[PDB]
Design a protein around this ligand. Sequence first.
Ligand SMILES: CS(=O)(=O)NC(=O)c1[nH]c2cc(Cl)ccc2c1CCCOc1cccc2ccccc12
Ligand SMILES: CS(=O)(=O)NC(=O)c1[nH]c2cc(Cl)ccc2c1CCCOc1cccc2ccccc12
Ligand SMILES: Oc1ccccc1-c1cc(C(F)(F)C(F)F)[nH]n1
Length: 140
Amino acid sequence: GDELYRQSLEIISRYLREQATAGATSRKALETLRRVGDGVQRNHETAFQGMLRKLDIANEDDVKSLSRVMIHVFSDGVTNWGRIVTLISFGAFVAKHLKTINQESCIAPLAESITDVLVRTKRDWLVAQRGWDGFVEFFH
Ligand SMILES: CS(=O)(=O)NC(=O)c1[nH]c2cc(Cl)ccc2c1CCCOc1cccc2ccccc12
Ligand SMILES: CS(=O)(=O)NC(=O)c1[nH]c2cc(Cl)ccc2c1CCCOc1cccc2ccccc12
Ligand SMILES: Oc1ccccc1-c1cc(C(F)(F)C(F)F)[nH]n1
């Protein structure tokens, strides 16, 4: 299979779903993402609220449009765990919004889309970092 994709989809999907409601690397990475991601979201509440209101997300077609938006984030050439975890954290903020507006059916597609953009765009950097073990190390 594709173990990095499997792990990434499991970690990101679980964190996003937890906004509405396994191997050791995945458990430790989800613990880390909860702790770090919740802090990122708290420290960005006002900023995330402002951008989200401009995105104007009401349904699955709006959520689908975010794939190309996320690909454009990585176009600045910045690759580090801070940028990656903050991208995931705004995704979680969107998932909370999808819960509020009764569009939870869009959360698993959103998590797959974040996973797809991250692993297609940054596969080779993620592998060099040893993946989610690198993530756990960075944020310890
Ligand atoms: C697919 S597109 O070309 O039609 N639209 C965008 O890429 C797009 N749409 C946005 C809507 C809002 Cl509300 C905000 C931003 C956009 C974007 C730009 C996407 C890339 O933005 C960034 C690029 C690089 C770093 C960033 C850091 C923090 C936030 C955004 C960053
Ligand atoms: C670590 S940083 O200092 O470089 N900051 C970010 O990476 C950053 N800052 C943000 C501010 C807002 Cl208001 C919203 C998002 C960010 C981010 C993360 C990179 C931009 O992410 C996105 C930007 C635009 C739309 C997105 C939709 C789904 C998931 C992420 C999206
Ligand atoms: O919360 C942490 C614990 C240990 C090491 C680093 C962090 C951390 C870094 C960031 C960030 F803001 F820089 C974000 F960009 F990742 N948030 N939390």
